[PDB]
Design a protein around this ligand. Sequence first.
Ligand SMILES: CCOC(=O)[C@H]1CN(S(=O)(=O)c2ccc3cc(Cl)ccc3c2)CC(=O)N1CC1CCN(c2ccncc2)CC1
Ligand SMILES: [Ca+2]
Lengths: 51, 235
Amino acid sequence: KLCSLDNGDCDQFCHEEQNSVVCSCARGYTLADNGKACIPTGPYPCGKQTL
Amino acid sequence: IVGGQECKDGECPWQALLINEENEGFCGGTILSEFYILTAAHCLYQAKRFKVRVGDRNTEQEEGGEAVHEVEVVIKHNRFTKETYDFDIAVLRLKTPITFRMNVAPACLPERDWAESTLMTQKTGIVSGFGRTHEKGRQSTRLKMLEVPYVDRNSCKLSSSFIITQNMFCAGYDTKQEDACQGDSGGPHVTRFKDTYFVTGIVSWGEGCARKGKYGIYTKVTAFLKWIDRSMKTR
Ligand SMILES: CCOC(=O)[C@H]1CN(S(=O)(=O)c2ccc3cc(Cl)ccc3c2)CC(=O)N1CC1CCN(c2ccncc2)CC1
Ligand SMILES: [Ca+2]
């Protein structure tokens, strides 16, 4: 729990479920298989500076 | 954008620009999706008919990547009112889809409760536009960005001359000559978190530009999320 320790170690949206964290991502990404990180689907995803 | 830095190449990819029949860029916007643009409600007044330009980082030299876009339908937030500037929000759906190239990408929408607790509680935010580089100077040629500190939900109200409502939020400085300005309206106020940007607010208003004991009044974006969606679905 404590989606306020360090964002529940999530990459984006942090969520609590009475006892622990539950990550999710902005529309356009897909949650990593480790429940925390978010990886894009297409090549130009929201939030990222086209560098 | 009085002071601030120059939006370097591919640094402000969501920066949309509302232009008029005179090809002059009067207001700004933020890209939310291949079809939708987020803008300050009042903005739909400083023009008669407007086009939405994207990809431009300079108003006088073809960068090749720009592109114009016509508006198919304009979603002004009904309950808006110049007399108070409350509910200064609106949404434009493009006639044709935007094509994400470099310098052209959409910014993310955060989750309300998440945003309010992590995005806004954050130390600072990012505001950008082609607006004035001084309260009196002429509009800007290049695309500028100025990182602005968050302002106390209270000091905000005190310094003001008018009610800072629910849908409002301060951001900027109390003495530093840095702040958005004329023409910047509609612009994107973004918060950065782990190398990703979220649309936290809209460029709403202020009293003058970069004035002392005065700040920049933005539109609390998270105070309209569900509206913005209802909009992405059109309504
Ligand atoms: C002399 C007082 O100056 C003003 O307030 C001006 C600001 N500019 S502007 O083009 O450089 C301008 C526009 C938007 C801005 C947004 C941010 Cl975050 C920061 C600076 C900004 C500056 C445009 C304008 O129309 N005004 C006068 C207005 C704007 C604010 N007012 C309200 C009254 C009741 N309720 C809310 C607001 C009074 C008249
Ligand atoms: Ca150009």
